[PDB]
Amino acid sequence: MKVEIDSFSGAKIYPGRGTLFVRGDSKIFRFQNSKSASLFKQRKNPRRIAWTVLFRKHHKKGITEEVAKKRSRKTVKAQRPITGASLDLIKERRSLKP
């Protein structure tokens, strides 16, 4: 059971809900409801319609803490050496100096 999104507005379309338009070139547009659908037929441009995801994304609305930092990294340092070359005499000769 997949939830779809509105190709015009970007809203979740839970099952069996809204309508589906198969354009002549076989691009498929889904609408959560008759509102997106009429704008879409009206050749309206989602980026200019203020309440749309696509609008809000473009006008950088609300996003705030997505541009807030995080904490994802590691710290390894485990030697394997080089296959067939005695991975034992590669750490005793790896005592370094400077």
């Binding site: 994802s72 590691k74 485990a78 394997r80 050496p81 080089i82 296959t83 070359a85 991975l87 100096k97």
Partner: protein, 177 residues
């Protein structure tokens, strides 16, 4: 779906099969890159952390970092880019691609371990596979051993034994620069 897991510390890798949407479902709506806590997928991997690196859907199309979408599309690809190998100079070819958002339509998740959980995993943490080749260019040897331009490489090059049957041999690179 099948999980293809790598321990990039040991060079280890082994695949795991998971049948249980619930256990899977953690991976859904997750992109390539995003991290994932372990216990949710199995008790084995508890507190293991997983990085999602890619994978192939059924029909085998590959994912492609940063398409977003959880479907397929047909991109134009070039030299120097995922999921494509040019056959000719300046060749570009249109090709189907799977999105980088994990659906249940994937055949395989590819994952990479970032933190090790509370328990060892058999063919992964337990076993360690050597790096195949060693430093060949001058100052690369000088940095795999930390040497200063004093110590002189020639005797710090790697040395891979091998046998002829009754003649065991010795062959080192060819230091450049």
């Amino acid at each position: 779906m099948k999980l293809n897991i790598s321990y990039p510390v040991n060079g280890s890798q082994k695949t795991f099969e998971i049948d249980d949407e619930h256990r899977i479902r953690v991976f859904f709506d997750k992109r390539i890159g995003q991290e994932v806590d372990g216990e949710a997928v199995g008790d084995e991997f508890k507190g293991y952390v997983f990085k999602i690196s890619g994978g192939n859907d059924k029909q085998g199309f590959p994912m492609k970092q940063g398409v977003l979408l959880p479907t397929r599309i047909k991109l134009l690809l070039t030299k120097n880019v995922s999921c494509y190998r040019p056959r000719r100079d300046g060749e570009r070819k249109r090709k189907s691609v799977r999105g980088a958002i994990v659906g249940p339509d994937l055949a395989v998740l590819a994952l990479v371990i970032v933190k090790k959980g509370e328990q060892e995993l058999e063919g992964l943490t337990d076993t360690t596979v050597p790096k195949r080749l060693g430093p060949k260019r001058a100052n690369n040897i000088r940095k795999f051993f930390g040497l200063s331009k004093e110590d002189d490489v020639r005797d710090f090059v790697i040395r891979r034994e091998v046998t002829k049957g009754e003649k065991t041999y010795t062959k080192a690179p060819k230091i450049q620069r």
